[PDB]
Design a protein around this ligand. Sequence first.
Ligand code: MG
Ligand code: MG
Ligand code: MG
Ligand code: MG
Ligand code: MG
Ligand code: MG
Ligand code: MG
Ligand code: MG
Ligand code: MG
Lengths: 44, 275
Amino acid sequence: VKRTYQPNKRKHSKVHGFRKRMSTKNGRKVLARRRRKGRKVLSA
Amino acid sequence: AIKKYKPITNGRRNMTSLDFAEITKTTPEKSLLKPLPKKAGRNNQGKLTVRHHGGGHKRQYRVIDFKRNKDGINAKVDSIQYDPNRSANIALVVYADGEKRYIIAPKGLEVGQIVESGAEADIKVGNALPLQNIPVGTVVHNIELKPGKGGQIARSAGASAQVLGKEGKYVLIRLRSGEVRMILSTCRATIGQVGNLQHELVNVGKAGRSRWKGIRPTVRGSVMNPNDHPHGGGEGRAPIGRPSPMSPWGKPTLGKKTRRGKKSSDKLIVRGRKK
RNA sequence: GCCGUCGAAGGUGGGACAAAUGAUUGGGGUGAAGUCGUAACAAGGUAGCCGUAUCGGAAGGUGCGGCUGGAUCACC
RNA sequence: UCUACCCUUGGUCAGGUUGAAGUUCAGGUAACACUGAAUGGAGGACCGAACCGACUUACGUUGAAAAGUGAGCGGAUGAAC
RNA sequence: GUGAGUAGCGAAAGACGGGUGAGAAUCCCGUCCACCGAUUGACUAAGGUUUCCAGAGGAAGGCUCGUCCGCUCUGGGUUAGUCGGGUCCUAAGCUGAGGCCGACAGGCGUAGGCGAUGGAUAACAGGUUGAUAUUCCUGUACCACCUAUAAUCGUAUCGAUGGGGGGACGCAGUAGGAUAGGCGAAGCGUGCGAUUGGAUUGCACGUCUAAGCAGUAAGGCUGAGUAAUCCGGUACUCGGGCUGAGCUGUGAUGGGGAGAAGACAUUGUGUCUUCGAGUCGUUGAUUUCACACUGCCGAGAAAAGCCUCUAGAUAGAAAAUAGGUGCCCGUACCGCAAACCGACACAGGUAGUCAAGAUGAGAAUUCUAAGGUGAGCGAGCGAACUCUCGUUAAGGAACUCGGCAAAAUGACCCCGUAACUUCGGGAGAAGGGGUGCUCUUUAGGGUUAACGCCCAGAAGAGCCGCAGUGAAUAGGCCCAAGCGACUGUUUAUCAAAAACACAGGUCUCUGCUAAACCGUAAGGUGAUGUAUAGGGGCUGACGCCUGCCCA
RNA sequence: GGUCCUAAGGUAGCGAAAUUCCUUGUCGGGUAAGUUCCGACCCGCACGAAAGGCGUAACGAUUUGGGCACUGUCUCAACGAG
RNA sequence: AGCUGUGUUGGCUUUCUAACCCGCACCACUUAUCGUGGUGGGAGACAGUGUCAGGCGGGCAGUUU
Ligand SMILES: [Mg+2]
Ligand SMILES: [Mg+2]
Ligand SMILES: [Mg+2]
Ligand SMILES: [Mg+2]
Ligand SMILES: [Mg+2]
Ligand SMILES: [Mg+2]
Ligand SMILES: [Mg+2]
Ligand SMILES: [Mg+2]
Ligand SMILES: [Mg+2]
């Protein structure tokens, strides 16, 4: 059996990272709700 | 012609190849090749348009001269090579300027040939000269359509056309599908019939070499449950139950004509198709 | 008396040829012609016959080639 | 990031086995030219590990594992992984 | 809380002597014993982020115990001009100045950029620590740059973002040349036996790199003035080195490694240490080192470093010597696992490199080497019952939904083989025989001057057992039907098929800004293809065929 | 041959079949005994010619019936090992 | 019923070029097969497009039975 999380340092940043949030417009609404709710970590 | 095979296996039972006896100098010329990345129906959105494509074998596009410029220069014919992008073979002419180029090869060609508009232009196989300068009853191929554009009609393997007559400003061409049609009088035409005539008897013989040419399987309609084909499932096998057999997007496919009222094709197409 | 070579019969196995027989089955001759039509021999009333196809309950009919072993006036 | 097709760039398959086209020599040919012996190494070809699968069956079922282990089983130079 | 002191304790060989301690089947040291050995062994990617290491700990975690630890406290650990990346280049893709489209948001795209899983790219042996090593220091190197320089040559030079070559490529097979590891006999060191007997008889080893000079088994092509250049085309008369090349030879090396002698210390602390000699010869030889070469059809990425050429810039640099400079990031540790993804110290899954001896075609099988481990619950008794295995009298499918499970057949070498067919097939058809050890003669390759060595096949003679592929590993077969032609693919996790694909047959639509499809549009796919080619509907190799009806 | 009607109103080939209700059709073969199986008949409840009809060597982890070989599946169970 | 020919209405055609259109040729922005600008060559008041109107439309939606 082969599970559903095969970790990678590059695809984790090229997809969920900071500069892929600020790329589009709806990423800047995601980052507008995680520094509003008061999270410690904005972007994984 | 076609070299047959002997049934040593059930795959090679009736498979029939095409003997490569008209191919000289099997290595290409390393200055007229351009790369050719594939796509299976993948347009600029990444989605899937046209179905049943993809895979097979890597290719490399070979730059062909369809324009036939360089007027009044004798061109030799050196070597007749193989081209995978199309059904005909290919030629390697050398103009006397040392400008080596490619020509789609007509039926019998090894000698040496000429492109010129009306000098004398030497009507033989392999010579390209405009349709006002061609006498009637003359089998041509690789015609242009718009003047100076490039040769478009009848470029296949074993295809041809036929000049019938000359009207007030156009000429009159019978095409391979049997459709008489007017073409402007300054379009060029190679004289002759394009070679490699034994092409449509190549029995592929096996679902594997029909599969490394860039073809994928085509599932029939009556075996899809009716989410995605109008010939939906039903218990058991079933007759189609429509008044008209339909394509997978609703349009009737068996009989109905499809072209629309189009500019510069209604006043030119005299006779229709014969099928 | 024991050991060995050769050695009939027997047992094992896959074949080869004829013969006896078998539910049904296809033509053939024989009779007695009752049943259904007239296809030949007169130009037999669509002139016949030999090859070769295709169709029909039944002889047979039509197509394309050859033959006179084809009447009339032998088809001048 | 699992899976489904897909594009660009790489990697991997112990061994053993039959003997297709052709080519050469000889035999007859000079007619309508086809038999044998060598050589050649063809294939979604045969037997079999790695490797990829999951047919039968027993156990397991508050499991060692929210899909597995024991004995066997199919593909294995390609429409392969 | 009851269920209950019940079910469990997560594959698997341990036994004892000594220490240690308040406490020991469990921790450490010793001897014997067993298990893997195409791996349970040895290095590197992915991923994790201090776990690695020494000194002290025993409350929690460990399926028990614990003096122990991948757990707690203190103090330490990762060294590069040469390895893997960045200062170099481009694939698929992504982003895009102007531009083109769209109620706004925004979608597409040209020049230019980003992007290695690929091309280019200068260093190797030995020593050492409690934890790091092509990184630290021992000995020899090499590439880029700078400065002094002398022999200096002087229109000699430096040459583009530009013209050209070049780099530059698939799968398959066979015969080679050399080397790596292997095995034997005879260089050297040590021991020669207290179980009958034996003294050419017993174990162990048989060295060396990159650089830079040499000459090489094979592989690939034969040579002149004229029409952004004198180069690359083109065409003309005449007409024996060129590149690329595994390997080897000296030197590198008076050096460094070495199975061991022999010279020093408290438990020889289980160690440093000073000097110390060997390194022949024969064979069997690869999957390592060429896409080389022949063949086949499905016709097998681009750009740079590098080499010439001129537009131009200038008239300043060979060789050799000497000194000087060379940056950023990752290095510890596990890495088929007690440290990664499965909640766990979980019988699963996790790309690649190295891979020896005996028997063997072999990376199969059985037993071992180098090298590791003994599986974090044990002690007793050997009842029923479940689970994994072994044998059985006479009979042999009588069992049962059904020969379901087991039992038999199994390797190599021989004799012999039917119907049927698309002439290939059927076919491992079936049914049969032989194999062990010792001794005598003879015909067979290669190596070699030859004794010598490895590879083998024949008859004959003889011996022993119940049994000679004596252990493990390795097809049961036959007759007749049904469906599908074939190999393939399908319901990750109750269905692997007679369903889907298929090669072939047809039918219809498309004259090119093609029909068709995605997208409100721009733009794209079809295709850098053009009726022997493209999209769709049905049937499903091959053979013989496909009948009437258009209300 | 008569006659009603339909747009004409099942041709070759197969037939108790993956198609047949009644039905365990019927006669033959196979077994000591055969509602399944194989060869035939045809009265097709309701086969039929590209939702193809009829045949077929080779290939199948397919489905159905019969033989030899081998055996704790069985009559009938007993003993030993972790 | 049918001749003639003027004042006004609605068509069918036929040809010319001035809009508009070209995924048509060299040329410049530029050592870009995108774009805009420029003499051509093609086709031309049809096509594309805006508003209105009629007809097909289980390709797709909302619901009843
Ligand atoms: Mg005659
Ligand atoms: Mg699996
Ligand atoms: Mg699967
Ligand atoms: Mg070995
Ligand atoms: Mg093994
Ligand atoms: Mg058999
Ligand atoms: Mg058979
Ligand atoms: Mg469009
Ligand atoms: Mg609806």
